[PDB]
Design a protein around this ligand. Structure first.
Ligand SMILES: [Zn+2]
Ligand SMILES: [Zn+2]
Ligand SMILES: [Zn+2]
Length: 283
DNA sequence: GCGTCC
DNA sequence: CGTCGTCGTGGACGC
DNA sequence: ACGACGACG
């Protein structure tokens, strides 16, 4: 089985994310549990928690089908002591909110060295940031997303993801999410079935499918190897529809949230219907 | 400085 | 009753 | 982008 959805808006309350996901016939969803551009939010209450849990129950969304994401502000490998501590406190709060909402996964980007520290030192800071959050919370897996590798951002090579995992004590609560736009912008080709196969064969050797906890299904406005993070609607960008058909027909992507972060929410329901249809169409 | 990032 | 214009919030990054 | 708020007339 495959679970397919989009990163829906949580405007007006978290329960609305489950309602919006049901409106596009999604079998999975992603959301921010608090505002993506702010350091802190009001603590979750019994009401908000119950309303969210009741809507997920009503629309058949178990924790295995939901992939929350953290804010844009957090930098888990920050080279500055004070900014690293602030990012770690916010990340702990993000994980605690997940635990309270009955969620079991949390998607986040590794972090950036800001040209101040080496890539090894940055990756080690990231692994320790994960260790601190896993030591403070329970039942939530830290899902590291790969990146396009803009600026000083890390996570653009599968080796970066494997190096962070190696530094994580509790391997049962660390995982990865592969974003197709990010992989393509980073130089992992997906334009042909042969390319997709090669990209995922390298992923299996370097990281391993035992850690894959989710996917982000995005076409790319940016070009191959551009190191530019610019998504596009499926079939409208530089990757094309073929890679998405290929993913849908490959059983290694079963049982995990497959999330659209495409730029045109007006067509999310068509993207979901097309993705579902690929499981019973020709290769 | 604005838009994207998700 | 709504919905425009605008601001606060505040982080890196492409362009 | 989300929530908030003044001003509509
Ligand atoms: Zn993504
Ligand atoms: Zn992206
Ligand atoms: Zn299958």
């Amino acid at each position: 089985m495959k679970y397919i959805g989009a990163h829906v808006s949580a405007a007006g309350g978290l329960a609305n994310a489950a309602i919006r996901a049901a409106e596009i016939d999604a079998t999975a969803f992603a959301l921010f549990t608090k505002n993506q551009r702010q350091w802190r939010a009001a603590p979750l209450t019994t009401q908000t928690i119950d309303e969210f849990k009741a809507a997920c129950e009503k629309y058949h969304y178990t924790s295995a089908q939901i992939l929350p994401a953290d804010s844009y502000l957090i930098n888990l490998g920050h080279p500055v002591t004070e900014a690293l501590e602030k990012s770690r406190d916010a990340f702990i709060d993000e994980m605690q909110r997940c635990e309270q909402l009955g969620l079991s996964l949390l998607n986040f980007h590794p972090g950036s060295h800001l040209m101040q520290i080496s890539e090894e030192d940055c990756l080690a800071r990231i692994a320790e940031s994960i260790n601190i959050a896993l030591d403070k919370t329970q039942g939530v897996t830290a899902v590291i997303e790969n990146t396009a590798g803009q600026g000083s951002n890390l996570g653009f090579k599968f080796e970066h993801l494997a190096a962070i995992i190696d530094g994580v004590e509790d391997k049962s609560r660390v995982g990865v999410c592969i974003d197709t736009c990010h992989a393509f912008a980073a130089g992992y080709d997906l334009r042909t079935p042969a390319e997709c196969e090669k990209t995922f064969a390298d992923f299996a050797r370097t990281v391993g499918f035992k850690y894959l906890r989710g996917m982000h299904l995005n076409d790319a406005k940016s070009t191959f190897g551009s190191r530019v993070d610019r998504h596009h609607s499926l079939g409208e960008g530089n990757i094309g529809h073929d890679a998405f058909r290929w993913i849908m027909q490959d059983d290694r992507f079963d049982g995990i949230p497959l999330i659209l972060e495409t730029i045109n929410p007006d067509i999310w329901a068509e993207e979901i219907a097309w993705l579902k249809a690929q499981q019973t169409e020709k290769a």
